[PDB]
Design a protein around this ligand. Structure first.
Ligand SMILES: O=N[O-]
Ligand SMILES: O=N[O-]
Ligand SMILES: O=N[O-]
Ligand SMILES: [Cu+2]
Ligand SMILES: [Cu+2]
Ligand SMILES: [Cu+2]
Ligand SMILES: [Cu+2]
Ligand SMILES: [Cu+2]
Ligand SMILES: [Cu+2]
Lengths: 328, 328, 328
């Protein structure tokens, strides 16, 4: 088979690809380095992060149904623990976790057949309590396996996107000291027992897109223009989310994320099950600012689950118009 | 276009309408007044409420797909803060929020095209932390945009309801003093910081239908008779719910609430995503008392998410019969 | 009508049955005894349990659509409270709860027509605060009503399972003393007020399959072989779950659990609404160990929602292969 070496890019962007496969099955070669590091989630809050390739979420991989995926996974000697990878896209050996456990100073190569079309979570899952802990420390991403002939709507008709954005949502459990200030540690292990107590409450201290509060706002805002059909691929490896595009809709939504299932239409809010990725297409109709949020608004605003989309184009008063401006 | 002025009625009832549109597109004129006021949620518990039209939820609006909606929104001078409105039914300007921000002593008129069929949440969303706070203080309702030719089942066949009820479910976060008694305040602002702490736990103190524990029980129980096809439109603007009609089913369920998607059948329990409205039709077969509940039973019973339906008619022993009464 | 007396077996197994009905409608006779008893959930944790037939979950009943179900329910004199049963499968009288309330030292016989195909929760629901309390003390099971002609896929084609397993997931709220140790009581009533406080937080202390942490692991692991099509019927009577078969998929998934609705395909993770049962079929392709988990991984690992499946057969390197073993 032909082998294609890909260069991953940081989320929310995606490496170069084509929606409709240009070839018959290929072996897609990917490489990722595991990076443990403290990251700043908010002005007053830090996480002892464990990442694929230095980003939360890990980068998006895009392949086609029937392709193979060959991952070189490296755990550099400066990391402090073993890691592995479980692809929900894959069949067998706990998604690949049972064949990819590597100590710092080791690498491994896993191949699997992308037999099923859909956006899928991949995440670290080293065993026992390590499993949730690695995941809630940021060790999860997504692979999108597109049908070879691209996406189809509820009627089996072609649908093409102009832009794909990968929104990784992650819940985190940062402990606080007696003074109510978030705690900081030398490394992940020193913070573990304090983090476990917060985990056991099941209440996140933070719920973020692209690894930090406000990551996808300001300079990081998503960009589009009126007329663009945009695919929003949204992962949540540990906890449910309820995405909503404020001022928009889900034109075609695969909330369970698997492309051979008929999508729903016209959704106001959809549902991402913890442990999964979903996808929604919207064609922008109005210019302006949009917020993409988890529509538990406390999670959106207090916990950090808000992104912005900035949309260029011309306003359509037939869709919406302020007939009388605020007046006494 | 023809203009139709509607008189809203308090939930769970709905203003006069016809399921199948009597006309081609019309401009539907609605007016609502914002009312801030303390409301009693339970025997020992009060909320500093912010409401559309003095009710939690705000009243149901019913229009048809392709109609326009023209809302006059008034913030009377006796209120203490700015408010706006975001219709999930609408396209652009954050659902209308970006064009409807009004100070006390102001009004605004917004028009939008109801381009998509479904039950949709509308809610206040003034910006930043104001967003969840206004919503969890009760500032949310629903608009139902029916297909011009009325509802259709999974086979595209006409389905007609005899009665519609709008069940608005709302989560609230009432703080407690050191003695464990729920706190009361002079106004919403005086209660804000205490309420924020409860919000951050993500645990509601109360989860209610129609604005109070027991609101839809006793005198407020819903009414039907055997043979009635009843549409239950159920909103939850901030948090998930899992409705269940005890002793019944969802005959046709649009849990994501959008009428051009095929409904599921025969559901025991369905799922309303926080930030959305869903709808379920049931044709009553047995007389008696039914409870309509959020089927997290702790939320149903301890938090307040229980309504009753009282159904007239004749019992059918073929469906169910007590063959042997309780005996030693 | 012909009468068929069934002998229930403890979960996760199912009493003898045939997927395709061998007959026209029959009256299915079942008997269950209510057993109150302390059960051990984990090494350090006990529950004051209330059970159908001495198991959490209660045993699986299997019938066909259009059959009748006739339950003899016995509350032996050694129990301390009244109990009843609500079948979500049934129509009228709060699912049968209104006709089955029995004191210790009493029995009752309820008949209902299994008019709707699907997996359905049954649970005790004696009234008011008793409702959630009985349920979270373990008093819930499942009845599966199969279409008379067996299961059909998304295209209406026959699908046959080789094995069915009933996974009952239950949330529990065990209180802790000042020393942080889980409390133990003489009986359910002595533990009630302490348990209520934990319930009101909505945070389970434990979330288990088959009634205990690790119940479906070790000796209790589920068994299959490559090529087996296995139906996983999964109930959760009070709280949502998000099942995932690690290293596998849901080939055909009815997450809302009702067999006349088209199933989704290729799911990584699916969603069981609290108050419902869902079902997923998977045909095993790789041998080895699988974990079946609630994919909130904190719930899976810290709270107890993990089961194992041990699968015999031959490994297929085309699906997955470790191309390079861990190396420096
Ligand atoms: O619809 N914005 O919460
Ligand atoms: O089915 N009543 O919880
Ligand atoms: O996919 N195992 O969490
Ligand atoms: Cu790891
Ligand atoms: Cu996983
Ligand atoms: Cu407001
Ligand atoms: Cu909204
Ligand atoms: Cu009971
Ligand atoms: Cu129930």
């Amino acid at each position: 088979l032909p082998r294609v070496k890909h260069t991953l890019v940081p989320p929310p962007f995606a490496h170069a690809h084509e929606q409709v496969a240009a070839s018959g099955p290929v072996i897609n070669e990917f490489e990722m380095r595991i990076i443990e590091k403290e990251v700043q989630l908010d002005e007053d809050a830090y996480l002892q992060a464990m990442t694929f390739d230095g980003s939360i979420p890990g980068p998006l991989m895009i392949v086609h149904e029937g392709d193979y995926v060959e991952l070189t996974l490296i755990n550099p000697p400066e990391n402090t623990m073993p890691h592995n990878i479980d692809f929900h896209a894959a069949t067998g050996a706990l998604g690949g976790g049972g064949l990819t456990l590597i100590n710092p100073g080791e690498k491994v190569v896993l191949r699997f057949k992308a037999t099923r079309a859909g956006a899928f979570v991949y995440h670290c899952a080293p065993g026992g309590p390590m499993i949730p802990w690695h995941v809630v420390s940021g060790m999860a991403g997504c692979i999108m396996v597109l049908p070879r002939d691209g996406l189809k709507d509820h009627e089996g008709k072609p649908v093409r996107y102009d832009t794909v954005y990968y929104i990784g949502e992650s819940d985190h459990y940062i402990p606080k000291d007696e003074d109510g200030t978030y705690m900081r540690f030398s490394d992940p292990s020193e913070g573990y027992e304090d983090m476990v107590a917060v985990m056991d409450t099941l209440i996140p201290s933070h719920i973020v897109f692209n690894g930090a509060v406000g990551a996808l706002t300001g300079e990081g805002a998503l960009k589009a223009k009126v007329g663009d059909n945009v695919l929003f691929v949204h992962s949540q490896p540990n906890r449910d989310s309820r995405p909503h595009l404020i001022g928009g809709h889900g034109d075609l939504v695969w909330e369970t994320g698997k492309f051979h299932n008929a999508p729903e239409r016209d959704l106001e809010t959809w549902f991402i099950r913890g442990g999964s990725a979903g996808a929604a297409l919207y064609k922008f109709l109005q210019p302006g600012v949009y917020a993409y949020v988890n529509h538990n608004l406390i999670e959106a605003v207090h916990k950090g689950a808000t992104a912005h989309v900035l949309v260029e184009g011309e306003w359509d008063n037939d869709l919406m118009e302020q007939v009388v401006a605020p007046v006494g």
